Write a protein that binds this DNA or RNA. Structure first.
Lengths: 109, 73, 81, 74, 93, 95, 93, 109, 94, 82
DNA sequence: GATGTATATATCTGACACGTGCCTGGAGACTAGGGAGTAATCCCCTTGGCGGTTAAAACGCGGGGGACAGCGCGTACGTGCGTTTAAGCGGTGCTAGAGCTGTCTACGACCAATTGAGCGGATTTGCATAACAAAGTCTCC
DNA sequence: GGAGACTTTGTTATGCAAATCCGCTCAATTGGTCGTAGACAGCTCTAGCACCGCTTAAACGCACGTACGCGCTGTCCCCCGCGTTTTAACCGCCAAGGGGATTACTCCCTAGTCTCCAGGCACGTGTCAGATATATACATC
């Protein structure tokens, strides 16, 4: 894995930015199972972090294309719809104030 | 004395402005220069509000030493 | 209240249609579109009201709307949830 | 009291006057688009004399009007 | 009165990905809904797998299977690699 | 001076595709929501956020419907959308 | 190896509605998938309602709300009326 | 209903479906930490109602086809020719169910 | 000889009434195994697993053909073409 | 090793399915398009059925793995368990 | 008149409906401990109204572009017919692997004490925008 | 006869919302004990694979003819775009008060344990409703 971690929290040991202890609590709470294994919140926090990073990266690139330094709902919508895997994962999601993509059928020109 | 402080800060900001203009520098340059000298970079919005004294007394006092250095350099 | 369905005016219908890429709209679209909107709203509102009532509240909140939409396969992001 | 010229402005009225003389009765929106593009394509060295003139004009403006405050309004 | 969210962690990730880009509050509201929705789907499927196989415990294996079932293509593959690595580092000395 | 028909429609399509604001005016939308709600139960109140959530969802729905409606019209070799293109899109879709 | 199904109960209902009609084993296999599917959906929604309102108990009220959200038209009304009677009678018996 | 005289819970509730089983299935399965006393009674009554409704319709289909027995096909006809059940079961595939005899008019001579 | 369309209408009634599988069983199994082999080698199937896959596949294709037929009618045709299949899938969201 | 069993879905298999669906006439290119569609449907269902099978550490795909694979896609199947 | 489908008989078969005896999950009666319900308090956000500005909707008109109906080719589909292939059935046999039980240990729940990461509420600070220098050409009040 | 619009870049000021800081709380982290869920080994014996040979129903190829798809023309409806009139949305501000959230008590309901025993299930009998085959007549093309 990554070379090291010494700090006390679980997120630090796992090399993550996302919380681990919180994830564990949320898994214990709403009746998903009677028991939650030690690696369950670690593995899951890493996955959520990965997916979070991809959307933000793509949205940030959209912001630069519009010559802005900020992510707004529109940039998130473009980031998702111009990426096939995210588009499938989030295919049914309505993003408030996200707008639409500029698709004009050629037959109308 | 808050009035004595106000006068000192008004005088400082006025000297800062006069040197900035005389020497041909912009508010953007004061900002960037401070970043290089101190690690704390300021935008021209901050410099404008400082010169216009639209900032709190504490901010002006805290920023002043950095600006004093800017004038000297 | 009565007849507020007419508050969805022709230009509203057209602007939505344009966003969707429609170049020409026949004259009967306006009525058909209103019928569709109304059905969508009744189904979403009815469920939001049902959640509101279950909880014994009198005010429909954003979350009751969000759950009502989630159940129809229309997950909405940005209003809580 | 009017504002001092910046480096673009010192350069552009020099070049705008040239453009107007070479091509009189040319609309300034054409001249301005061309001047904008040329300025963007200039090096720091090429801009430098206008930068130095702009610096001098700003200092002179302040000395002429030490109490000038730019007050734009909506 | 206290309400939790992932706003702080989302910000922290944005910093590493794009050091000079900020995020609006509305965009952040969307990112929080995104994280909560993915969390529930994965946790939901992992729960079902444990039930199907007659287990009472959710482990990293169910989470991994749930990830493969829910995420498409290469998105799933890279997610699996990151999860595997985090667990390995976590349990290692 | 005049523009030939369709010139403006294309400008509008680009304009609306670029912007993000809501297209249905808010007060009449809000009254429609209340009218419907009264039939289910009287004396309900709504948070302003509930109304906004409904409106955002409604437009997203109608916009998506128009995109599919438009495809049906193209399939039929038309530019103009008709009630039956809406009905076909809904039926195939499963509503 | 022991399994449970509702074939006894399905059969008993059939004889009340149609005393002279039998049912094939494949038809019975379908009726068991049906009962299990409806059970899960109602129980699933009732679980969610309890969670949403921050409760840990499923009562007849959640089951009733879940029925209204899941069944269309008049099935919801008749199902609610029948559920109400069963609870009423049970309580008093 | 007027009365019951038995030791079971299904009898008290006037039901044919088991009550104790429903309670057991609600407790197991992680639906909640707790299951109320009326929850399996109310639920058993609902399952019974829906079961009875399908069988009655399927039985009528069997008689229309001049049969004494219900087979998967009759269950499919019973559902598809009834709007409320069709919505409830709109996505369900029935093994050996068959289809309704729908022919478009434009295909006819 | 019968005119074109007499037989097709006959067959439509016949197939709508019956319930049997239309795809031959052994060819279907080989297809299932071929696909499964690409995902993982040495898998076995229960005979009931294959029947479940086959019932689902036919139900899927039959439903697709019903929507395909509507599209062809909308376009004022009798004959179904690849574009009607594609339109139906697109509207559905595949 | 198996290959080319997609052709096991013969023209009459396709025609019969189309007729059950009410299709009166079939274009000559339908046959190929239909095969492409069937194959995609099967790959997605099989892939999930295999995933459940591996999770459980079995080598035999059962009816239940197929049923969950289908349930998951919104296609509940009745009669093979559920 | 020719080609298909439903209906009047006789026989038997796989499939169902019934009855024993053996558990093993369902029901009854106690107890304890938390959860949900009640009443009383605060105060945040909702409804409702008011007048004024003006941006969007409604209306009419005329003109062009597109929906629609009708016609005529030509080829791509259906429908028969005879030959060929591979499915389906039954039979024999082998063995991998599902499904169960029984020991035993590492794993996670639970508790109680401790402590730093994260929460709200202030307070600093940057983005995003827009006004104006010069100058000549053209438009409208 | 005079103002202002129009264009370019770069430096200044300005509204609002986002990034950063403080102090305190309380959810996350140690560390230890307990009990049981699940890992592992070994056994039975189900049911899934593989092959062979025969019948025979379905698939395959090819010839023929015509019903349908496609392109073209021409007519008339009806939707677009413009400019003018009118209408109701939107903006601020204000007051009134109803319902949502919080807190602190109280009592009832459900989990858990233990006991008892009859309703439900594998397994073996016993009877028949509709398929399979023949022969008659009418429905549809």
């Amino acid at each position: 894995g990554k070379a090291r971690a010494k700090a006390k929290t679980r997120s630090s040991r796992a090399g993550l930015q996302f919380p681990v202890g919180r994830v564990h609590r949320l898994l214990r709470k709403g009746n998903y199972s009677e028991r939650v294994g030690a690696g369950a919140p670690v593995y899951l926090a890493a996955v959520l972090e990965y997916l979070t990073a991809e959307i933000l990266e793509l949205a940030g690139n959209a912001a630069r294309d519009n010559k802005k330094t900020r992510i707004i709902p529109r940039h998130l919508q473009l980031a998702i719809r111009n990426d096939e895997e995210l588009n499938k994962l989030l295919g049914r999601v309505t993003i408030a104030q996200g707008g639409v993509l500029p698709n004009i059928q050629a037959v109308l020109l | 004395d808050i009035k004595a402080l106000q006068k000192e800060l008004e005088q400082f900001a006025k000297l800062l402005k006069q040197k900035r203009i005389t020497l041909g520098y912009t508010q953007a340059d004061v900002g960037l220069t401070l970043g290089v000298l101190f690690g704390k970079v300021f935008s021209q919005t901050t410099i404008c509000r400082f010169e216009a004294l639209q900032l709190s007394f504490k901010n002006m006092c805290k920023l002043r030493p950095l600006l004093q250095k800017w004038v000297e350099e | 209240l009565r007849d507020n369905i007419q508050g969805i005016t022709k230009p509203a219908i057209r602007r939505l249609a344009r966003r969707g890429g429609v170049k020409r709209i026949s004259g009967l679209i306006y009525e058909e579109t209103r019928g569709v909107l109304k059905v969508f709203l009744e189904n979403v509102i009815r469920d939001a009201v049902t959640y509101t009532e279950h909880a014994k509240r009198k005010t429909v909140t954003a979350m009751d709307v969000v759950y009502a939409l989630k159940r129809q396969g229309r997950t909405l992001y940005g209003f809580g949830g | 009291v009017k504002r001092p010229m910046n480096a673009f402005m010192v350069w552009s009225r020099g070049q705008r006057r040239k453009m107007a003389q070479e091509n009189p009765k040319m609309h300034n929106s054409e001249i301005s688009k061309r001047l904008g593009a040329e300025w963007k394509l200039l090096s720091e060295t090429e801009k430098r004399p206008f930068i130095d003139e702009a610096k001098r004009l700003r200092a002179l403006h302040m000395k002429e009007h030490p109490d000038y405050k730019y007050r734009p309004r909506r | 009165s206290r309400k939790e969210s992932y706003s702080i962690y989302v910000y922290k990730v944005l910093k590493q990905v794009h050091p000079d880009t900020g995020i609006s509050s509305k965009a952040m509201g969307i990112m929080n809904s995104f994280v909560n929705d993915i969390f529930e789907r994965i946790a939901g499927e992992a729960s079902r797998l444990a039930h199907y196989n007659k287990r009472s415990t959710i482990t990293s294996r169910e989470i991994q299977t749930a990830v493969r079932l829910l995420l498409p293509g290469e998105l799933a593959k890279h997610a699996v690699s990151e999860g595997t690595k985090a667990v390995t580092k976590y349990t290692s000395a | 001076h005049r523009y030939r028909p369709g010139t403006v429609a294309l400008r509008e399509i680009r304009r609306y595709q670029k912007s993000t604001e809501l297209l249905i005016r808010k007060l009449p939308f809000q009254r429609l929501v209340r009218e419907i709600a009264q039939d289910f139960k009287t004396d309900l109140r709504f948070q302003s956020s509930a109304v906004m959530a409904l409106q955002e969802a409604c437009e997203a729905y109608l916009v998506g419907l128009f995109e599919d409606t438009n495809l049906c019209a193209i399939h039929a070799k038309r530019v103009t959308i008709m009630p039956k293109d809406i009905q076909l899109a809904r039926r195939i879709r499963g509503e």
